[PDB]
Amino acid sequence: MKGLYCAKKLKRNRQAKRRNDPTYRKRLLGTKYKQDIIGVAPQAKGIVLEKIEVEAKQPNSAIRKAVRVQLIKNGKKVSAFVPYDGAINDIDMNDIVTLEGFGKKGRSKGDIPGIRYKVCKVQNVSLLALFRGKKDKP
């Protein structure tokens, strides 16, 4: 396919090659639409269902304070990890919290397994405001 009149064959062939590229594979499939949690739109906001006990991947031995959250726009039940030490007591049941990704392109961050999203705001006020006491939860 390297002849001077092979351009339509090369476009036909290299596109079929490009379908095996994993970065192009997600845009071709539309996986950001198949999960409407964080792909197409950032900052998913949903209702907390229960506090989750999840243990870190070994060799690290700790317990991350995750929460199940049902989204408002979807109804999808996704688990989300609470940062900022002691914040799990500042969030309660039937709160409406906003969730963000980890900066890992949809995978788990560090020792946590399975948890692909993390909370930033609870009842439309941030956890950085509550970890230091800057604002107040209504």
């Binding site: 002849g3 001077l4 009149y5 092979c6 351009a7 339509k8 090369l10 476009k11």
Partner: protein, 133 residues
């Protein structure tokens, strides 16, 4: 035979048969001048004019008596790959009876943009060159 009495245009200015010169530096075939056919769609002895693009293509199909399929093969350049592509489009071209027997499959035929003669016919055969020549 024919649904209407076969009739041609009144020749303004063989003075008993109507035939016009289509212009653009072309010639009327002598089969059109000395002929008895009454095709109204013919560029020379009929009610169409030649205006617009005149391209040269090769006859692909001579089926379906008055129309022919003319393929114009061209190259399109893909700027990314820096190679060409062989492309083509087929045209339903009106073949006047003045070219009957003269034009056969394979001949290089120059076609001129007419009116919209049929649904898919916008070109008419104005001249031709044999493949063997």
């Amino acid at each position: 035979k024919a649904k209407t009495y076969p009739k041609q245009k009144k020749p303004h200015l063989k003075p008993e048969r109507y035939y016009k010169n289509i212009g653009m530096g072309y010639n009327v075939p002598e089969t059109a001048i000395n002929g008895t056919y009454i095709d109204k769609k013919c560029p020379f002895t009929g009610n169409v004019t030649i205006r617009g693009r005149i391209f040269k293509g090769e006859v692909f199909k001579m089926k379906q008596e008055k129309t022919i399929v003319v393929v114009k093969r061209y190259f399109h350049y893909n700027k990314k790959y820096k190679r060409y592509e062989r492309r083509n489009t087929k045209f339903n071209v009106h073949l006047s009876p003045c070219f009957f027997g003269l034009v056969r499959v394979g001949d290089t035929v120059t076609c001129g943009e007419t009116r919209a003669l049929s649904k898919t016919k916008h070109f008419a055969v104005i001249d031709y060159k044999q493949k063997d020549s």
